[PDB]
């Protein structure tokens, strides 16, 4: 699909807020003309599906101000210092929920904002869990819950798992639990 | 008791396409924090199902990630119109199709950490093939895809666009008679 590609002619960081950094590019498109492209520069991230011995998954409730609501999510966070995302996933599982896992499996990489961010999220399945203690940052507010996967799938259908990364996790888990994808 | 209360708001950035809101909020610890996110108008995406059982999809280059994606057609809400209007227009502009049977599936939030974007996903059936009407700067190829092939592509990591991957999973549930 080389005939669809756009070639970068110029780049600049047009804005840096408290948290968000925006790149503004000029690109040459397949018509040979020049167009502006704008996107957030994001470090990447990891999310995991932590599957307990009893078959439930460990999830969280977290308020997200950008949408003004509380979401049911799988634990996740941003990639720090360009680390391997497996390290990101281990740290975030520990900090957000207090769990460690003996068995980690990479599932897939998703891109949640292809129109305006370079963000990718690596999704992992975590098994053989043991509990320790949740360790939250100042400014981080998280309630931990156990969810039955059948109940999760019904919530997806009902529109109650609108967070894309978590919904995608639910569908990958469903495939895994049914023995279709493993 | 997780809800954060807005103390102030301002639009700190407006570029060619992106707008950033910055709020001061009071959190459950009673302390003040900054929250920063993209102001997005919302969007629709749709899954156009053909009588031969294939779905209409697109290939589109996405500069933010520097690759070509397989996507279901989509676009941004214009002038706070109903997202079904958005879906009808974008299906016609991006793919050249019209549909007489539309069904809302679900609403997703692709960027809960830093955008208020929502995308409403629809299933479209009973299709007529007219022609694309692309905007300047828009480059899209239309392809026809077998759902079984799509699901294998998802497994292989070749449908990394969250909205399209989600559409694939919903379609799989619909086709399997489960939902
Ligand atoms: O899952 C996302 C959460 O973790 C990430 O590290 C980010 O800092 C922010 O978006 C939120 O705190
Ligand atoms: O699907 C997304 C596409 O459509 C939307 O209307 C936006 O303008 C932009 O992200 C892209 O051109």
Residue numbers in the entry:
A (entry chain A): 1 to 182
B (entry chain B): 3 to 181
Please give me the paper's original passages concerning this structure:
Bd-NDPSase crystals soaked with UDPG displayed electron density that could be interpreted as a glucose molecule in each active site of the asymmetric unit. Modeling of glucose, sulfate, and glycerol molecules in the unbiased electron density revealed that these molecules are located within hydrogen bonding distance of catalytic residues. R64 makes a hydrogen bond with the sulfate and glucose molecules through its guanidinium side chain. Water molecules mediate the interactions of these molecules with other key residues such as E96, Q140, and K165. The glucose molecule is shifted toward the expected position of the phosphate of a phosphohexose product. The proposition that E140 functions in catalysis is strengthened by the fact that substitution by glutamine renders the enzyme catalytically inactive, as evidenced by both relative activity assays and kinetic assays.
Of particular interest is the Bdellovibrio bacteriovorus HD100 nucleoside diphosphate sugar (NDPS) hydrolase Bd3179 because it appears to have some of the characteristics of the Escherichia coli adenosine diphosphate ribose (ADPR) hydrolase and the guanosine diphosphate mannose (GDPM) hydrolase. Bd-NDPSase is a homodimer whose monomers are related by a non-crystallographic 2-fold axis. Each monomer comprises an N-terminal and a Nudix domain. Phosphate release assays revealed that among the nucleoside diphosphate sugars hydrolyzed by Bd-NDPSase, its highest relative activity was with GDPM.
